[PDB]
Amino acid sequence: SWEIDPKDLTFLKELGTGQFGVVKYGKWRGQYDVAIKMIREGSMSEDEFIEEAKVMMNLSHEKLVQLYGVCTKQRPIFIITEYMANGCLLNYLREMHRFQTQQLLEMCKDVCEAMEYLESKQFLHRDLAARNCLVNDQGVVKVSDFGLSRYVLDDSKFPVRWSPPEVLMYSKFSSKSDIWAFGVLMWEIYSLGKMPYERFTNSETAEHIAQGLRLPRPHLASERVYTIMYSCWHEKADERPSFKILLSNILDVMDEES
Numbered sequence: 001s002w003e004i005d006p007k008d009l010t011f012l013k014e015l016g017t018g019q020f021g022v023v024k025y026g027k028w029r030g031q032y033d034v035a036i037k038m039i040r041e042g043s044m045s046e047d048e049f050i051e052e053a054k055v056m057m058n059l060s061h062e063k064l065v066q067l068y069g070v071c072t073k074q075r076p077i078f079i080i081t082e083y084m085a086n087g088c089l090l091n092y093l094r095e096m097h098r099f100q101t102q103q104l105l106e107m108c109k110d111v112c113e114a115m116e117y118l119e120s121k122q123f124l125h126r127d128l129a130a131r132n133c134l135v136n137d138q139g140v141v142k143v144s145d146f147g148l149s150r151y152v153l154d155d156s157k158f159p160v161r162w163s164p165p166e167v168l169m170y171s172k173f174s175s176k177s178d179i180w181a182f183g184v185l186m187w188e189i190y191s192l193g194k195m196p197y198e199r200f201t202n203s204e205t206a207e208h209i210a211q212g213l214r215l216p217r218p219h220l221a222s223e224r225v226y227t228i229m230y231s232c233w234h235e236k237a238d239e240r241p242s243f244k245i246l247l248s249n250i251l252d253v254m255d256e257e258s
């Protein structure tokens, strides 16, 4: 299956503390560079996650952080993935790399590709945000932590700033809720890691979201690009474009800038 022998891993350095515990860098079998996530005890519904990991393991796409396996025959649980040299996208954006507007749209395309794949498989992310994206040594952005919020053990919140009205009111997660979050993700990229609704608390942001207050147009984003992210914020979920339409629109803008 997808079980990796924990005795075939080696911890060289600790990259930091992500969601669910610490992340290590090391070698798999003494042959492959990999990152190792140590699921902190008591931070996740492990039984449900272990059984669901089989489905998430089979998801294959270049813009999805490639998963190599897990170590569930022990504790803490291990998750072996590829090593993204540049780490989290949020910290990567807040470090100005002298980002060119063409590069910003490039990052949106990377995420939109992975989301279009998850959409084709009817797999919801539920927590799409710059903090959950990773960048490799070549500057490619890949989506991660997809479908994990459903197993988080809680021991308004912050993710409200990325949620649509139907999620804040009825927790009605769907493909259109990922569309809304992706629109906010585009806002973070063109905002260079700026926090959405930084002036309001979590509860205040939810109130303004329920009232219709959309995120403003970032400075580095043209009206052409802002129209794409703005389309993700239709009040009616059924009126929001799919990731196929979003990816198609992003491709049209990139082709014109060529």
Ligand SMILES: Nc1ncnc2c1c(-c1ccc(C(=O)Nc3cc(OC(F)(F)F)ccn3)cc1)nn2[C@@H]1CCCN(C(=O)C2CC2)C1
Pocket: 015, 016, 017, 018, 023, 035, 036, 037, 052, 053, 054, 056, 057, 065, 067, 070, 079, 081, 082, 083, 084, 085, 086, 087, 088, 089, 091, 134, 144, 145, 146, 147, 148
């Ligand atoms: N791969 C990396 N490479 C370089 N750095 C990496 C990382 C990671 C990472 C490692 C594994 C997963 C992970 O398991 N995703 C998953 C599991 C799933 O479950 C299953 F697998 F399907 F079962 C299902 C879906 N996605 C996520 C992320 N985190 N980090 C850094 C950790 C510390 C903070 N940080 C930063 O950037 C700040 C600036 C210092 C990021």
